[PDB]
Design a protein around this nucleic acid. Sequence first.
RNA 1: AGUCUUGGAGGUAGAGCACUGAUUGGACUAGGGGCCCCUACCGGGUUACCGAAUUCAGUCAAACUCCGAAUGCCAAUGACU
Length: 58
Amino acid sequence: AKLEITLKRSVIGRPEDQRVTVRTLGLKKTNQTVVHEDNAAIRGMINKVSHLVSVKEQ
RNA sequence: AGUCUUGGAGGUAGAGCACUGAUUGGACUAGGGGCCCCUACCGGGUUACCGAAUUCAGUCAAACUCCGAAUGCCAAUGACU
């Protein structure tokens, strides 16, 4: 299915490894709501971070 | 470029004491002197006077490895952004 991905959190103050992964999700600023499909590829990014992001299912 | 995917290369942290060294303690002991006895340093007895090896347990390492993670790196492979 689909799921929404937002930010509670800014990227400034976080390492370089977790910085570009935010860029690849389409997320640039804070509070930028972005929807994608429930796939294990994007789930692996969330499982890698899970703490800049408040996840949102449907 | 990132994530997931399978595939490795590699010998730290850890852990182990099998190699390397270090080192505890007991049993045991070649052998060694010593109380010295009998006495050509020659015949043999003796102790906790030591003791190599010996095995039993016991620790220890930046330059000890039979072992060995997380990650990080080169990948192929598709998928997504």
